[PDB]
């Protein structure tokens, strides 16, 4: 409603770096808000795509950003009569970035790994890896919980059980307020998907460079299954956290599985021990229900609510025809211990192939009316197909069915404007939470400042 679409701020990265593929707000030890931006196709030392991370200071003019440096060299360690190998080419460092306290966690979901033992091997596979950095101090750390040293033959004997070789950990990520990093690995367990959790402080204290394979005893991974409903379900494509069990000491996990049960798609709410509390089933196959999840209390009752995006939903139209537009689902948490019912509200896109619901960002309370609000992206929507971001204001009964404001892409066609979103942070310190929008196709990020209501 009260975002300013006239005077924007533009940050930019190298050409073809996909700068803006992921973004988050970052507060240093003094509370000064910056913007961390992931560019998964940034050139490395060997002139090859490795990815990169940029830490943009807040400036009303924007412009270029300094790099948040990480080690991009491939590593090899000959230990225990084995050969451990890391491969960082096309690893996509910056495909997901997230900030907690004065720490930034940037992940390379496609970093490959292999273990050589004589003529055998573990198979060169994308286990993924996340890089951690405390910018002010310069401390660095890595976390790659799916790296193994088991040879290929053993997985065949056990029918590919507990096979974490293709995790792509860091595909999605989130950090609990207690400081526990939760990584989504949608390829874990032979593309069933798994979640990896570990305290941030323990990742730093247990990490030493060159070890490659080390124990993080305080970590906790999800479990394999034999249920064909989870096969090729990509559990962990999207992740989020919230409070859904009434206990404020525990933190609950929200996980997206957009191809669950033969591309029906699902979203599951779990406790910290990965025991399922709820499961939201998709409405239509191949709609990619669960591509994105968002947690915020929209109706002002203190209870976290859930939003699920299905960007490929095909709406029913006249003459028995379907039109792919995308759809967002709103679930209100009921009072006390009860199961989340049917959706309280359905928001459906309008532009064909717009992918409405590709990203859902909680804005906090934008217009300062007491109810939190959200922003939904349609990166190929709008009358021109250049991309749109729509703002939906919360109300006592949930959300408004019509948008209060529509943001048209200021970038050329194909920029994927809105593919990544982030709000609920006042970056210019004017008392109103703002919105940062990524457009990796144009290698830029646009900052929308919230102003007093007119």
């Amino acid at each position, epitope marked *: 409603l009260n975002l300013d679409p006239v005077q924007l701020t533009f940050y930019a990265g190298p050409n073809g770096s996909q700068f803006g593929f992921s973004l988050d707000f970052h507060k240093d030890s003094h509370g000064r808000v910056a913007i961390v931006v992931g560019a998964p196709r940034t050139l490395g030392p060997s002139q090859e795509e490795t990815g990169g991370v940029f830490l943009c200071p807040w400036r009303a003019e924007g412009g270029q950003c300094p790099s948040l440096l990480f080690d991009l060299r491939d590593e090899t*360690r000959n*230990v225990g009569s084995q050969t451990l190998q890391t491969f960082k080419a096309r690893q996509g460092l910056g495909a997901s970035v997230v900030s907690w306290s004065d720490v930034i966690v940037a992940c390379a979901p496609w970093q490959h790994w292999n273990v050589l033992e004589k003529t055998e091997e573990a198979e060169k596979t994308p286990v993924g890896s996340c890089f951690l950095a405390q910018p002010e101090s310069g401390r660095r750390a890595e976390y790659s919980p799916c790296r193994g040293n088991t040879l290929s033959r053993i997985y065949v004997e056990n029918d590919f059980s507990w096979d974490k070789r293709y995790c792509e950990a860091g595909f999605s990520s989130v950090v609990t307020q207690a400081g526990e990093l939760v990584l989504g690995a949608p390829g874990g367990y032979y593309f069933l998907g798994l979640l990896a959790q570990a305290p941030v402080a323990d990742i730093f204290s247990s990490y030493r460079p060159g070890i490659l394979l080390w124990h993080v005893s305080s970590q906790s991974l999800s479990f394999d299954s034999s249920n064909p409903e989870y096969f090729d379900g990509y559990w962990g494509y999207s992740v989020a956290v919230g409070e859904f069990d009434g206990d404020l000491n525990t933190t609950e996990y929200v996980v997206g599985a957009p191809t669950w049960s033969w591309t029906l798609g699902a979203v599951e709410i779990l406790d910290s021990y990965y025991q399922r509390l709820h499961r939201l089933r998709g409405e239509q196959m191949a709609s990619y229900f669960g591509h994105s999840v968002a947690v915020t209390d929209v109706n002002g009752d203190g209870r976290h609510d859930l939003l699920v995006g299905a960007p490929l939903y095909m709406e029913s139209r006249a003459d028995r025809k379907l039109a792919e537009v995308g759809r967002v689902y709103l679930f209100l948490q009921p009072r006390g211990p009860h199961a989340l019912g049917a959706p309280s509200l359905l928001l459906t896109g309008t532009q064909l192939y717009g992918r409405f619901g590709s990203a859902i960002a909680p804005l906090g309370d934008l217009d300062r009316d007491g109810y939190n609000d959200i922003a939904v992206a349609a990166p190929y929507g709008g009358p021109s197909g250049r991309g749109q971001v729509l703002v939906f204001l919360g109300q006592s009964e949930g959300l408004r069915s019509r948008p209060s404001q529509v943001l048209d892409s200021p970038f050329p066609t194909g920029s994927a404007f809105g593919f990544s979103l982030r709000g609920a942070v006042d970056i210019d310190d004017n008392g109103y939470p703002d919105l940062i929008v990524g457009a990796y196709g144009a290698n830029q990020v646009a900052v929308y400042r919230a102003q007093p209501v007119v």
Partner: antibody
Amino acid sequence: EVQLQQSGAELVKPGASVKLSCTASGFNIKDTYVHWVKQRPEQGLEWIGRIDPANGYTKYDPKFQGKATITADTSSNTAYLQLSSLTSEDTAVYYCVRPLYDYYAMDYWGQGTSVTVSS
Amino acid sequence: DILMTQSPSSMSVSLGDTVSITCHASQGISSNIGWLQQKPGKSFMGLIYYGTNLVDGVPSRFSGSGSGADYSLTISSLDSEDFADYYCVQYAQLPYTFGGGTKLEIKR
């Protein structure tokens, strides 16, 4: 805290067999590798072998192939070392070892089990 | 197997001295080495792993260094509890092999 508690000292006769224990305290034995090391005053320290209690796979120094047999039971959270066809040269102190962070390291040690072979 | 030649076999030193124990390998092991301590009549304590990393709880006066097939353990300002045995161990290849052992004795 990580503490490795081993069985008491053993006094046995040559040609017999003995089975030492190594119980995990403060953690799960299934987490890391578990090694076995032999110590003698003259011959010094020797690496017997290792085991991954999560699956039972083992590795051995070929010098001990036959006498030493390393096993583990995750139920009792314990790892075992069995020595057969005992000799006066087997009289030694035996430790079980596990690493701290590095998968292949040798950092945490038990108090050591004394073994005396004599007729 | 990989031979681990530790030196010296023993040394007589005083408190506050800065001493260095060396450990040579029959081949390159690329920092895949650990150092151990055995106080008189007691069990083993881990000091260093992967050449330079201190085990949690070990004082900062201990310090490891080296590369290839030559490494060292240095104790700056010896303490009364440091008078004990010290062993090096490689784990680059299986089987793991230890050094001969170094004993720190009080000079008088």
